[PDB]
């Protein structure tokens, strides 16, 4: 069972594996003294062991780059959220039993929800 395996793996100190250049960007110790990475090398490769505290440190302390391109390449996903935001809902009708994408919310076992997408 992978679920319990990862439950146990996350309890260790450095369950993540990263490259060697990480040592040049983020420091070995937090502002409180917590360790972020260790000198030990991975078996079979030159990777190093890293802790999730390194991930959080990078997210809150690290280089910034413009992400203008992201919406362009992931256009299909953003179109969905736009349509959902600009849609209009309606009353629920309990009766015997662009639209298919939201099929899990419109139809049901014995009820119908009125929906017209905002696009």
């Amino acid at each position: 069972n992978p679920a319990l395996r990862m439950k146990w793996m996350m309890a260790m100190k450095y369950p993540i594996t990263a490259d060697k250049r990480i040592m040049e960007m983020i420091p070995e110790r937090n502002e409180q003294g917590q360790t972020l990475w260790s000198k030990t090398n991975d078996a079979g490769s030159d990777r190093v062991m890293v802790s999730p505290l390194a991930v959080t440190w990078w997210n809150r302390n690290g280089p910034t780059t413009s992400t203008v391109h992201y919406p362009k390449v992931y256009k299909t996903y953003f179109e969905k959220v736009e349509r959902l935001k600009h849609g209009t809902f309606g009353p629920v009708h309990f009766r015997n039993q662009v639209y298919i994408e939201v099929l899990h919310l419109t139809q049901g076992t014995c009820w119908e929800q009125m929906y017209t997408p905002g696009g």
């Binding site: 319990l4 309606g90 629920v92 309990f94 009766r95 015997n96 919310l105 014995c110 009820w111 929800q113």
Partner: protein, 515 residues
């Protein structure tokens, strides 16, 4: 283009896979090609005897009869932990630690009691060596006190492999493995004993257990996260249903059972998988929030886990469990067949009558569990889920007939009471909250007392339920063979007390329905 020729060996194989009185595959294909249907089925039906028929036996109000239950000594409790007799030593931890060491919590909970005394055995175990249990309890106390005399405080306590722990955890009981050539000439060489379970009759304690499982407490045992804001009306209705159910069911005892079992199984699995060749000690701890919103931590007892060299998903790991309680064992002794009970302390409670000095007993038992049972017990929370669905389904069904949701007519109406119990004066009707608690208790107990007999009984009794319902609907029911169904239903009532209770419930419902 395409060339697929049957060779000699395949031709010789296919020449023998034809109906009788046919010679070769080519002859069979020729016969099938030129076949035209004429009066074959009608003839064969004519030659058939008249004993092959399906007569329909009418079903009437006087036809069905109550099920038959087995006989023998009464059934005994067979759960991994006490349910109705549990007692907990409670403290407060205002520093909210996400996951701390439980040993220190156990010690801190222990240090709040000042009434210990010399233990003795009052209800013994007939088929076991009693003094070993007492020695085990004293050993655990001694180890807890030894924890103080150490340069550094440890996180886990590995018990010394003593004689009493060697016996209690069944050490060196497996026979020796050899080959068949050496030991062929032995007088007593056979295969294992493949017999059937020994029958037992129903007892009155399981009904009380279920009744107390459907009651309210003064604490909150479940805390759930948040979801987004509800914009669609369907989401408004869904949130209303969910919030009403959660409010009605969050103070129930079944939630306490769920959390207790989840914690115990998680601890057992982690200990078994980590320390394979050590006799680990694992306490039983739970967390609650009082009526004032103030946290509390409860301790129930201890377990000691032996060697855990598990290979398959059915290999067994043994352990010894000690629990606190106040239930005098000498009131329903047949319920405690496999327990050894000691009187270890004297507690004092405070109520309207003033202060009363009650005794405090300890239940000690050797048990075992597999990897699959522990894996399936770590996720008791789904019981809640199941219960909700049941309730919701009812409303959904009741809506389709009238083409209108009836959530408010079900929950807030404060009327429309459902017949949920039984009383000497007659059937008893309860509100919706009682119904929700009853369904949650049923799901929890289904998870606690799982067994193949329960599955068989449910599957084979569903059909009788539906037949009776059709009869109550004046649809003129009829059965091709009714006695076989009764035999199949009754073949599954052997040992489990839960299945016997369900059978008794079915008998009572059958009596009341046809009246």
């Amino acid at each position: 283009e395409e060339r697929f020729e049957i060779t000699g060996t395949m031709r010789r194989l296919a020449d023998q896979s034809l109906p009788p009185n046919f010679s070769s595959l080519e002859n069979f294909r020729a016969y099938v090609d030129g076949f035209e249907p004429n009066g074959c089925i009608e003839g064969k039906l004519s030659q058939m005897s008249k004993e092959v028929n399906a007569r329909i036996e009418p079903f009437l109000r006087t036809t069905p009869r109550p099920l038959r239950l087995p006989d023998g000594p009464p059934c005994s409790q067979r759960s991994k932990f006490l349910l109705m007799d549990a007692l907990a030593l409670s403290i407060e931890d205002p520093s909210h630690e996400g996951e701390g060491i439980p040993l220190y919590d156990a010690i801190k909970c222990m240090k709040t009691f000042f009434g210990w005394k010399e233990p003795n055995i009052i209800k013994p175990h007939e088929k076991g060596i009693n003094p070993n249990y007492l020695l085990t309890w004293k050993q655990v106390l001694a180890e807890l006190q030894d924890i103080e005399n150490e340069e550094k405080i440890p996180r886990t306590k590995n018990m010394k492999k003593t004689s009493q722990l060697k016996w209690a955890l069944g050490e060196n009981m497996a026979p020796e493995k050899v080959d068949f050539e050496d030991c062929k000439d032995v007088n007593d060489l056979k295969q294992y004993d493949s017999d059937e379970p020994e029958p037992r009759s129903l007892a009155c304690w399981i009904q009380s257990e279920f009744n107390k499982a459907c009651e309210l407490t003064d604490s909150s045992w479940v805390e759930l996260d948040e979801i987004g804001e509800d914009v669609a009306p369907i989401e408004h209705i869904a949130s209303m249903r969910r919030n009403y159910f959660t409010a009605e069911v969050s103070h129930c005892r079944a939630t306490e059972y769920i959390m207790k079992g989840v914690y115990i199984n998680t601890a057992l699995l982690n200990a078994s998988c980590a320390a394979m060749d050590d006799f680990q000690l694992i306490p039983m701890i739970s967390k609650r929030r009082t009526k004032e919103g103030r946290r509390k931590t409860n301790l129930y007892g201890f377990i000691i886990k032996g060697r855990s060299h598990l290979r398959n998903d059915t290999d067994v790991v043994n352990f010894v469990s000690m629990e606190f309680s106040l239930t005098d064992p000498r009131l329903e002794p047949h319920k405690w067949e496999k327990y050894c009970v000691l009187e270890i302390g004297d507690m004092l409670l405070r109520t309207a009558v003033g202060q009363v000095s009650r005794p405090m007993f300890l239940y000690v038992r050797t048990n075992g569990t597999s990897k699959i049972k522990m894996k399936w017990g770590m996720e008791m929370r789904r019981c809640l889920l199941q219960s909700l669905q049941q309730i919701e389904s009812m409303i959904e069904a009741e809506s389709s007939v009238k083409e209108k949701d009836l959530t408010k007519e079900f929950f807030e109406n404060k009327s429309e009471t459902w017949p949920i119990g039984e009383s000497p004066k007659g059937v008893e009707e309860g509100s919706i909250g009682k119904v929700c608690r009853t369904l949650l208790a049923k799901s929890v107990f289904n998870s606690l007392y799982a067994s193949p007999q329960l599955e068989g009984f449910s599957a084979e009794s569903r059909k009788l339920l539906l037949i009776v319902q059709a009869l109550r609907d004046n649809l003129e029911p009829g059965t091709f063979d009714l006695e076989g169904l009764y035999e199949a239903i009754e073949e599954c009532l052997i040992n489990d007390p839960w299945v016997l209770l369900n059978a008794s419930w079915f008998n009572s419902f059958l009596t009341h329905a046809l009246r």
